[PDB]
């Protein structure tokens, strides 16, 4: 069979940087070749494994995540960084095997005047540990401020939908990777 990467890549809406769409996935066969024959992203940076290799390697579980950031801010998403999204909203674990995809969101997440519905978490009582989620608005004020998504702003301040993958064959069984 398969299992629908569509609902994260080919979806409509987008989750915030603190409330982000976490999704364990398993018992599949996944045509990463689809991820390739898409040819629509901006960046497809793959840690601990090369895109051809993650095809022919055992996968027990996945941890797909869907959200958005402001363009430049995508730099924050890497092992060992600081910033709003880098620490105060997420963190890329340093035992990692999955890998990251991201691309512009202009005619889906922007418009004249801009969009507001996206809210970061600018402060925090605790910089979100690897992969953790503080979906509240705890004080440190409630730090969740929006970002403007304007066609005339900086391109690094244009909205970029990010979708991350995170693989885990700890000891869990088979049924991923396709072939």
């Amino acid at each position: 069979n398969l299992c629908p990467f569509g609902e994260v890549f080919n979806a409509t809406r987008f989750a915030s940087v603190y409330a982000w769409n976490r999704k364990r996935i398993s018992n599949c066969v996944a045509d990463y070749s689809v991820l390739y024959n898409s040819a629509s992203f901006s960046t497809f940076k793959c840690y601990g494994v090369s895109p051809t290799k993650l095809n022919d390697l055992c996968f027990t579980n996945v941890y797909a995540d869907s959200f958005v950031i402001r363009g430049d801010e995508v730099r924050q998403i890497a092992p060992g960084q600081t910033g709003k999204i880098a620490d105060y909203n997420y963190k890329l674990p340093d035992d990692f095997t999955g890998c990251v995809i991201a691309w512009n969101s202009n005619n889906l997440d922007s418009k004249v005047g801009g969009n507001y519905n996206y809210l970061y978490r600018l402060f925090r009582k605790s910089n979100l540990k690897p992969f953790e989620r503080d979906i509240s608005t705890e004080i440190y004020y409630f730090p969740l401020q929006s970002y403007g998504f304007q066609p005339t702003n900086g391109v690094g301040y244009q909205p970029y939908r990010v979708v991350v993958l995170s693989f885990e064959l700890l000891h869990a069984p088979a049924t991923v990777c396709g072939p």
Epitope: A39, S40, F41, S42, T43, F44, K45, C46, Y47, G48, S50, G71, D72, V74, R75, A78, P79, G80, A102, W103, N104, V155, G156, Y160
Partner: antibody, heavy 118, light 105 residues
Framework: QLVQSGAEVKKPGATVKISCKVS????????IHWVKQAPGKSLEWIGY????????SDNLKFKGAATLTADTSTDTAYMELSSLRSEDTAVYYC?????????????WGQGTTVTVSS | IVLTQSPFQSVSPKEKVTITCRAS??????LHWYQQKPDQSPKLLIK???QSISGIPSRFSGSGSGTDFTLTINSLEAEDFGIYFC?????????FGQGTKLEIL
């Protein structure tokens, strides 16, 4: 400024590794692109490595197992090309890159040919 | 994301000679352009197709709309021309068009 290895020639079947060392800024905080330059033809992108993690976004077009590794100790990136073969007798270039999606390759290595014969 | 800008050039120098980056269906606002010299590691000329980086004489300007972009080398002489490659962007395999060699009288 970037510095490669000298010009090289090899056999089919086996593999090779090439390198590129960096000077003048914070290496660990700047991508490095690897670009193939054809023999008497156009260009072709082959990948890039982040210096700090295996940010090896790898163009598929040729899957000669073109693996990228690096080292922040000596500030040198390594391109491990496998399956040396006819389509590879070209000039490979490291290239200075933006750290994230402002990608431009403006500072380069000397360019190294990797000739393939019998 | 295939590019097919301009096979080569053959024109009197000193003129406003245009090389026409015909982008495929993918309208990417971003781009780049690099100057190549014979057996010389090329260097990016036009950053983001509109901004100038430090160290470029203003002989060749870059512009364009959506997908289709252009580079107008204004008043180019017999001292500067070589090959000129176009550099795609965000679309994942950052393909490079088959370039723009520049020959002149």
């Amino acid at each position: 400024q970037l510095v490669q290895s000298g010009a090289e020639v090899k056999k089919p079947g086996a593999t090779v590794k090439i390198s590129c060392k960096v000077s003048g800024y914070s290496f660990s905080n700047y991508y490095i692109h690897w670009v193939k330059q054809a023999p008497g033809k156009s260009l072709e992108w082959i990948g890039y490595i982040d210096p700090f993690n295996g940010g090896t976004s790898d163009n598929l077009k040729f899957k000669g197992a073109a693996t990228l590794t690096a080292d922040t100790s000596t500030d040198t990136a390594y391109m491990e090309l496998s399956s040396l073969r006819s389509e590879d007798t070209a000039v490979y270039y490291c290239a200075r890159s933006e750290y994230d999606p402002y990608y431009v390759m403006d500072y380069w290595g000397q360019g190294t040919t990797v000739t393939v014969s019998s | 994301i295939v590019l097919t800008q301009s096979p080569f050039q053959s024109v009197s120098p000193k003129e406003k000679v245009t090389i026409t980056c015909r982008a495929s269906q993918s309208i990417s606002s971003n781009l780049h352009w690099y100057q190549q010299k014979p057996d010389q590691s090329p260097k990016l000329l036009i950053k983001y197709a509109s901004q100038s980086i430090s160290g470029i004489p203003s002989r060749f300007s870059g512009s364009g709309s959506g997908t289709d972009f252009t580079l107008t080398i204004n008043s180019l002489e017999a001292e500067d021309f070589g090959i000129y490659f176009c550099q795609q962007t965000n679309f994942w395999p950052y393909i490079f068009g088959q370039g723009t060699k520049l020959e002149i009288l």
